[PDB]
Design a protein around this ligand. Structure first.
Ligand SMILES: c1ccc([C@H]2CCCN2c2ccnc3[nH]ccc23)cc1
Length: 159
């Protein structure tokens, strides 16, 4: 449903090949210490997909042929005025070999060895839908970094 208030655009890119997925260990700032897809804030003057590519390149060195819209997640953090509006993409057309950046240390994971205990707890809900090639809309309300207070999740035809 609707979540009122100013939101800030973010991207999240999952490089998902047939038997493995690329994740990055976040090395600094909010969420350091957890594995996640590549992304960050969308800037003034670039499209959401541009920002997704830019972030993947800054964080892993990779470029891709194509990105595919797979989901949208809204995050609320208790006490934080701004909502996070996260646009999730997937790709299987990487150009290059991933390398470590200031922000992220990339590693490949087998699809049955996804490190959910060292990921954001919301990923346990929506990551399986990405693996199943289902498009989704999610909402998660957090108290701090560990506790989901409320959430919604459904599949969509249009991201
Ligand atoms: C793009 C890249 C990284 C993030 C991380 C760090 C800031 C906050 N953040 C999250 C918060 C909550 N769930 C989440 N699931 C994956 C990420 C995530 C967000 C967008």
């Amino acid at each position: 449903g609707s979540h009122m208030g100013a939101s800030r655009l973010y991207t999240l890119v999952l490089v998902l090949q047939p038997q493995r997925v690329l994740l990055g260990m976040k090395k600094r700032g909010f969420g350091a210490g957890r594995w996640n897809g590549f992304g960050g804030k969308v800037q003034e003057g670039e499209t959401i997909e541009d920002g997704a590519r830019r972030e993947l390149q800054e964080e892993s060195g990779l470029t891709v042929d194509a990105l595919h819209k797979v989901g949208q997640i809204v995050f609320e953090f208790v006490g934080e005025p701004e909502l996070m509006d996260v646009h999730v993409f997937c790709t299987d057309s990487i150009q290059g070999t991933p390398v470590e950046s200031d922000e992220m240390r990339p590693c490949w994971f087998q699809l049955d060895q996804i490190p959910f205990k060292d990921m954001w707890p919301d990923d346990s809900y929506w990551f399986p839908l990405l693996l199943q090639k289902k498009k989704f809309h999610g909402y998660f309300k957090f108290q701090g970094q560990d506790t989901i207070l409320d959430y919604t999740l459904r599949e969509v035809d249009t991201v």
